Amino acid sequence: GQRWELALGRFWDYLRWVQTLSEQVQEELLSSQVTQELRALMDETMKELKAYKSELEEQLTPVAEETRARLSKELQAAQARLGADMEDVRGRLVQYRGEVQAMLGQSTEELRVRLASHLRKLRKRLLRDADDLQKRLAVYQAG
């Protein structure tokens, strides 16, 4: 894949592990290591995506200009959606950390069930937006 796709792939691999919510995951969630790592992986994905779009603009098919503008704005919106989705994942995990830190030594099982359900929905959104972004990038040059 492209550099940005490999960066997103590392985000996916790390998130899949987090979604197991094992005791190893819990340790890294409560220390903030998980959200620092997701921030790093998100930032790298977005940096590579912006650089990729910039290089694609060196190999464009000429089109009506109105069309090129439309497609460029649609692509920028798709990039922004991806970044917002990754940040929503990270923010939901920050929320979980704060809730666990407020509850002394009480059982986190219900919190974990609710987190797992929510993360599944956030992953669905990130995945549909990533696939949409790849579709737009694939037809961007031909216009």
Residue numbers in the entry: 23 to 165
Describing publication, verbatim:
Human ApoE is a 299-residue protein component of lipoprotein particles and a key regulator of Aβ aggregation and clearance. The three polymorphic isoforms of ApoE, i.e., ApoE2, ApoE3, and ApoE4, differ in amino acid composition at positions 112 and 158. Compared to the least frequent isoform ApoE2 (C112/C158), the most common isoform ApoE3 differs by a single mutation (C112/R158), whereas the AD-associated ApoE4 contains two mutations (R112/R158). The ApoE protein comprises of the N-terminal domain formed by a four-helix bundle (NTD, residues 1-167, helices N1, N2, and H1-H4), followed by the hinge domain (HD, residues 168–205, helices HD1-HD2), and the C-terminal domain (CTD, residues 206–299, helices C1-C3).
Despite the crystallization of full-length ApoE4, we could only obtain ApoE4 NTD structures (residues ~ 22–165), but with well-defined loops conformation. Although our four new ApoE4 crystals belonged to two different space groups (orthorhombic P212121 versus trigonal P3121), they shared similar crystal packing contacts. Two NTDs (chains A and B) formed a T-shaped or V-shaped molecular building dimeric unit that stacked with another adjacent dimeric unit, resulting in an elongating crystallographic fibril. While the angle between chains A and B in the T-shaped dimeric unit was ~ 100°, the corresponding angle in the V-shaped dimeric unit was significantly smaller ~ 75°. This ~ 25° angle difference between T-shaped and V-shaped packing was retained in both the orthorhombic and trigonal space groups. On the other hand, 5 of the 7 ApoE4 structures have V-shaped packing, indicating an ApoE4 preference for this packing pattern. The C112R substitution in ApoE4 led to the formation of a new salt bridge between R112 and E109 and the repositioning of R61. Consequently, the helix H2-H3 interaction between R61 and E109 observed in the T-shaped packing was abolished, and the four-helix bundle was destabilized. The “domino-like” effect of the C112R mutation was further exacerbated through the H3 helix up towards Q123, which directly influenced a tilt between chains A and B. The side-chain of Q123 was oriented upwards in the T-shaped packing, while it was rotated downwards in the V-shaped packing. The upward orientation of Q123 in chain B was stabilized by interactions with W39 and T42 of chain A. In contrast, the absence of this interaction in ApoE4 structures resulted in a tilt (~ 30°) between chains A and B and the subsequent formation of a geometrically distinct V-shaped dimeric unit.
